[PDB]
Design an enzyme around this catalytic site. Structure first.
Site, PDB file in Angstrom:
ATOM      1  N   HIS B 428      78.373  -7.057  58.118  1.00  0.00           N
ATOM      2  CA  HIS B 428      79.416  -6.545  57.266  1.00  0.00           C
ATOM      3  C   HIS B 428      78.938  -4.830  57.703  1.00  0.00           C
ATOM      4  O   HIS B 428      79.683  -3.989  57.088  1.00  0.00           O
ATOM      5  CB  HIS B 428      79.181  -6.580  55.918  1.00  0.00           C
ATOM      6  CG  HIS B 428      78.192  -5.692  55.173  1.00  0.00           C
ATOM      7  ND1 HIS B 428      76.724  -6.133  55.526  1.00  0.00           N
ATOM      8  CD2 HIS B 428      78.321  -5.089  54.054  1.00  0.00           C
ATOM      9  CE1 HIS B 428      76.124  -5.128  54.653  1.00  0.00           C
ATOM     10  NE2 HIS B 428      76.796  -4.691  53.836  1.00  0.00           N
ATOM     11  N   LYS B 504      81.359  11.913  51.684  1.00  0.00           N
ATOM     12  CA  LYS B 504      80.451  10.798  50.827  1.00  0.00           C
ATOM     13  C   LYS B 504      80.323  11.346  49.432  1.00  0.00           C
ATOM     14  O   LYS B 504      80.229  12.453  49.140  1.00  0.00           O
ATOM     15  CB  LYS B 504      79.063  10.795  51.618  1.00  0.00           C
ATOM     16  CG  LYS B 504      79.424  10.043  53.111  1.00  0.00           C
ATOM     17  CD  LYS B 504      78.058  10.029  53.715  1.00  0.00           C
ATOM     18  CE  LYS B 504      76.906   8.886  53.312  1.00  0.00           C
ATOM     19  NZ  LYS B 504      77.451   7.476  53.524  1.00  0.00           N
TER      20      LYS B 504
HETATM   21  N1  G2P Z   1      81.023   4.435  59.272  1.00  0.00           N
HETATM   22  C1  G2P Z   1      79.927   4.477  58.354  1.00  0.00           C
HETATM   23  N2  G2P Z   1      79.203   3.404  57.781  1.00  0.00           N
HETATM   24  C2  G2P Z   1      78.175   3.639  56.740  1.00  0.00           C
HETATM   25  C3  G2P Z   1      77.949   4.857  56.495  1.00  0.00           C
HETATM   26  N3  G2P Z   1      76.905   4.873  55.681  1.00  0.00           N
HETATM   27  C4  G2P Z   1      76.487   3.669  55.411  1.00  0.00           C
HETATM   28  N4  G2P Z   1      77.283   2.959  56.323  1.00  0.00           N
HETATM   29  C5  G2P Z   1      77.192   1.589  56.585  1.00  0.00           C
HETATM   30  O1  G2P Z   1      78.050   0.856  55.835  1.00  0.00           O
HETATM   31  C6  G2P Z   1      77.019  -0.493  55.653  1.00  0.00           C
HETATM   32  C7  G2P Z   1      77.471  -1.249  54.346  1.00  0.00           C
HETATM   33  O2  G2P Z   1      76.500  -0.895  53.499  1.00  0.00           O
HETATM   34  P1  G2P Z   1      76.674  -1.664  52.057  1.00  0.00           P
HETATM   35  O3  G2P Z   1      77.988  -1.992  51.666  1.00  0.00           O
HETATM   36  O4  G2P Z   1      75.596  -2.841  52.008  1.00  0.00           O
HETATM   37  C8  G2P Z   1      76.194  -0.116  50.955  1.00  0.00           C
HETATM   38  P2  G2P Z   1      77.001  -0.300  49.253  1.00  0.00           P
HETATM   39  O5  G2P Z   1      76.702   0.909  48.453  1.00  0.00           O
HETATM   40  O6  G2P Z   1      78.573  -0.505  49.652  1.00  0.00           O
HETATM   41  O7  G2P Z   1      76.498  -1.704  48.531  1.00  0.00           O
HETATM   42  P3  G2P Z   1      76.824  -2.148  47.102  1.00  0.00           P
HETATM   43  O8  G2P Z   1      76.010  -1.796  46.077  1.00  0.00           O
HETATM   44  O9  G2P Z   1      77.206  -3.842  47.444  1.00  0.00           O
HETATM   45  O10 G2P Z   1      78.274  -1.461  46.890  1.00  0.00           O
HETATM   46  C9  G2P Z   1      75.645  -0.157  55.967  1.00  0.00           C
HETATM   47  O11 G2P Z   1      74.730  -1.130  56.131  1.00  0.00           O
HETATM   48  C10 G2P Z   1      75.710   0.799  56.535  1.00  0.00           C
HETATM   49  O12 G2P Z   1      75.593   0.321  57.948  1.00  0.00           O
HETATM   50  C11 G2P Z   1      78.752   5.778  56.776  1.00  0.00           C
HETATM   51  O13 G2P Z   1      78.568   7.042  56.210  1.00  0.00           O
HETATM   52  N5  G2P Z   1      79.840   5.537  57.871  1.00  0.00           N
HETATM   53 MN    MN Z   2      79.779  -2.262  50.279  1.00  0.00          MN
END
Ligand code: G2P
Ligand code: MN
Ligand code: MN
Ligand code: MN
Lengths: 170, 505
Positions: B428, B504
């Site tokens: 993912h 962000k």
């Molecule tokens: N295109 C981008 N991808 C990003 C960015 N910042 C982080 N990520 C990518 O998105 C991927 C998904 O991150 P996650 O869903 O695991 C972080 P999230 O806060 O949504 O986890 P939850 O607590 O389950 O909601 C992460 O591994 C990163 O590789 C960004 O600024 N741009």
């Molecule tokens: Mn997520």
């Protein structure tokens, strides 16, 4: 004088305005007995004190200190939080969750300080209070939103230098 | 975590060039083996986490991803393997990037809310435009500011479109159908959304009052953390047929990637179910290795109540991402003085990565009904699968992989080998290589902002002096993740995109 922190100190910087900086200078700094430790996906709260009660209240203050600079919060209102659990871990879980809910709904309350008045270690019940005001983007700086409390690697040490470790979902 | 590192390696076996096996005994009561897919560069990060997550013989530390994969392999009713995907890293119950499937005809099979995660149905939506990089470069900062002005981001933000308790009750039941009825979504959006943007078993009566009070002010907000709304530019097309069905015409085309979930409503739904199951694991006599893996038999009342509220939280997340889409369309229309329809701002796909799904799969030659848990991993169904939108029946299901705000992102498609080895599950994202705490210490916020500027990427963040926590070096190399999945045969690369503006929270 026991050094409970496991990492060198590292204050998070929230980008204070001159008015936010002035609200903090107006009040007595809150004593901080917590730190933000390593966890690959989220963050581990580490808090401690002279009593279990203080370790708990510092953990709640650690959680709020991740959302904003609590030094900019004025003590305009007092809020009460009582909860219970089946053991110290679930009590800690529900305590942090009840405070998180005070911030996320209804009156959107952010405490400048939290104090645990009692922990009943036979029933695993807790009484606490906090003083602060309604969170406001015009008044308080934006840190990180806390999504939830977790049991991941949760540790409650209830001996001479009480301390807790809690991973929260961010 | 009291074993020596070399004693831990006694349970680890490389299966092939891209896959490791976690043998039974690694943690207690494993019902199946665990596996994780890593190439050489990702292998080192994964084993360093194993060594360093609980290094000391004292208090503190956390559980490394390998241990969590094993703990999940101990959950009753699991079949095949507990699977870590190339972006796998330590989470809070399941690992982030962890899949486990349970046979719904095994009366001991469980459902674990604390393993599905607090951000229920958090997902990624990719939009396309008929704009080119050359059209945006002149107004990059203005567009970055227009996005920031339209989309509420960060802690304490509230939705700009007014919503009342009744609207929320309908959104929980209808998902994107609500956004369509109210005029915030187009009919084409629903057609290119996973599940068509609505889980029909959603029951708002299973969502608590607390969840509804948290969710109301936050519907139509991005959140914080790693959530983002990113303007991107198409950089490489690996599958011209896939690109054509997705509406991607040429390198240089501008797209928008939005990543958000079910917000406080979903976080609360997960918490309520987690609490209800600790209160219920005695009756059904369920043992777990980790309190965060609290669970219930799938057929129990607690399990059914969770699944129905999970589906309602899923519908909320789809409504939230549609609101982000509507607001993104408003921003583009204002900056380019053109209607969103005249900008071809359509949804390519919307896919989620924190959800449990009832799916048909073959286990050891027999077709079975499985409850598939995907924590931080995506469904990636193969070509010719009936449950894929018609436009992607021959390409396979699109998968949306965000990298970082300063590297790249990818689009992949599901494969038949993936359907066979991982129950149609792929990565993912890139996953994390450094905690936020370690990034705060080892990196300077201005250095991160300058590097982004030297790359020509416009940025608007809620807490600028905390941006090092999202630095590109904090995450794995997304290309290693996608290439591992591709070489393993569980995903096929389709598109590569480059960021040019990002907001962000
Ligand atoms: N295109 C981008 N991808 C990003 C960015 N910042 C982080 N990520 C990518 O998105 C991927 C998904 O991150 P996650 O869903 O695991 C972080 P999230 O806060 O949504 O986890 P939850 O607590 O389950 O909601 C992460 O591994 C990163 O590789 C960004 O600024 N741009
Ligand atoms: Mn997520
Ligand atoms: Mn998280
Ligand atoms: Mn999320």
């Amino acid at each position: 004088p026991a050094v409970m922190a496991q990492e060198e100190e590292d204050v998070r910087d929230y980008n204070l305005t001159e008015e936010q900086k002035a609200i903090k200078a107006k009040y007595p700094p809150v004593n901080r007995k917590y730190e933000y430790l390593d966890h690959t996906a989220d963050v581990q709260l580490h808090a401690w004190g002279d009593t279990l009660e203080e370790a708990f209240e510092q953990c709640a203050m650690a959680m709020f200190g991740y959302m904003t600079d609590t030094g900019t919060v004025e003590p305009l209102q007092t809020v009460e939080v009582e909860t219970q659990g089946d053991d110290l871990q679930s009590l800690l879980f529900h305590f942090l969750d009840e405070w998180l809910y005070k911030f996320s709904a209804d009156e959107f309350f952010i405490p400048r300080e939290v104090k645990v008045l009692s922990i009943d270690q036979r029933n695993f019940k807790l009484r606490s209070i906090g003083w602060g005001e309604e969170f406001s983007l015009s008044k308080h700086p934006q840190g990180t939103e806390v999504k939830a409390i977790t049991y991941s690697a949760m540790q409650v040490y209830n001996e001479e230098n009480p301390e807790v470790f809690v991973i929260i979902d961010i | 975590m009291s074993r020596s590192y070399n004693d831990e390696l006694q349970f680890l076996e490389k299966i092939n060039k891209n896959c490791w096996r976690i043998k039974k005994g690694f943690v207690p009561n494993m019902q199946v083996e665990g596996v994780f897919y890593v190439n050489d560069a990702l292998e080192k990060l994964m084993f360093e986490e194993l060594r360093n997550a609980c290094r000391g013989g004292g208090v503190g530390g956390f559980l490394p991803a390998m241990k969590q994969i094993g703990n999940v392999a101990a959950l009753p009713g699991i079949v095949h393997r507990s699977i870590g995907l190339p972006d796998v890293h330590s989470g809070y119950g399941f690992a982030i990037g962890n899949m486990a499937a349970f046979d719904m005809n095994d009366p001991e099979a469980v459902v674990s809310p604390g393993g599905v995660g607090f951000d229920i149905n958090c997902g990624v939506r990719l939009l396309r435009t008929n704009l080119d990089e050359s059209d945006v470069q002149p107004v990059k900062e203005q567009l970055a500011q227009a996005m920031f002005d339209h989309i509420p981001v960060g802690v304490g933000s509230k939705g700009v479109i007014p919503m009342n308790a009744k609207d929320l009750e309908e959104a929980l039941e209808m998902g994107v159908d609500w956004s369509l009825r109210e005029g915030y979504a187009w009919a084409e959006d629903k057609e290119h959304c996973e599940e068509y943007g609505r889980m029909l078993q959603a029951d708002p009566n299973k969502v608590s009052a607390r969840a509804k009070k948290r969710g109301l002010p936050q519907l139509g907000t991005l959140g914080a953390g790693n959530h983002y709304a990113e303007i991107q530019v198409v950089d490489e097309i690996f599958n011209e047929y896939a690109a054509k069905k997705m509406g991607i015409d040429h390198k240089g085309q501008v797209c928008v990637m939005i990543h958000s979930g079910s917000r406080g409503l979903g976080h609360q739904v997960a918490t309520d179910a987690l609490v209800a199951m600790e209160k219920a694991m005695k009756r059904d006599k369920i043992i777990v290795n980790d309190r965060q893996l609290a669970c219930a038999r799938i057929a129990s009342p607690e399990g059914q109540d969770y699944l129905k509220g999970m589906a309602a939280a899923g519908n909320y997340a789809w409504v939230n991402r549609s609101s982000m889409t509507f607001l993104t369309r408003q921003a583009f229309a204002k900056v380019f003085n053109t209607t969103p329809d005249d900008l071809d701002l359509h949804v390519i796909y919307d896919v989620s990565h924190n959800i449990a799904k009832v799916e048909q799969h073959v286990v050891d030659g027999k077709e079975r009904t499985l409850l598939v848990h995907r924590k931080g991993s995506t469904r990636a169904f193969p070509p010719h699968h009936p449950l894929i939108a018609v436009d992607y029946q021959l390409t396979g299901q699109p998968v949306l992989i965000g990298g970082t705000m300063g590297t790249c992102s990818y689009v992949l498609t599901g494969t038949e080998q993936g359907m066979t080895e991982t129950f149609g599950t792929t990565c993912h994202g890139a996953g994390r290589a450094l905690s936020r705490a370690k990034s705060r210490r080892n990196l300077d916020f201005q250095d991160v902002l300058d590097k982004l500027a030297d790359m020509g990427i416009a940025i608007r963040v809620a807490s600028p002096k905390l941006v090092m926590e999202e630095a590109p070096e904090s995450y794995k190399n997304v290309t290693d993740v996608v290439n591992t999945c591709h070489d393993a045969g569980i995903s096929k690369k389709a598109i590569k995109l480059r960021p040019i503006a990002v907001i962000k929270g």
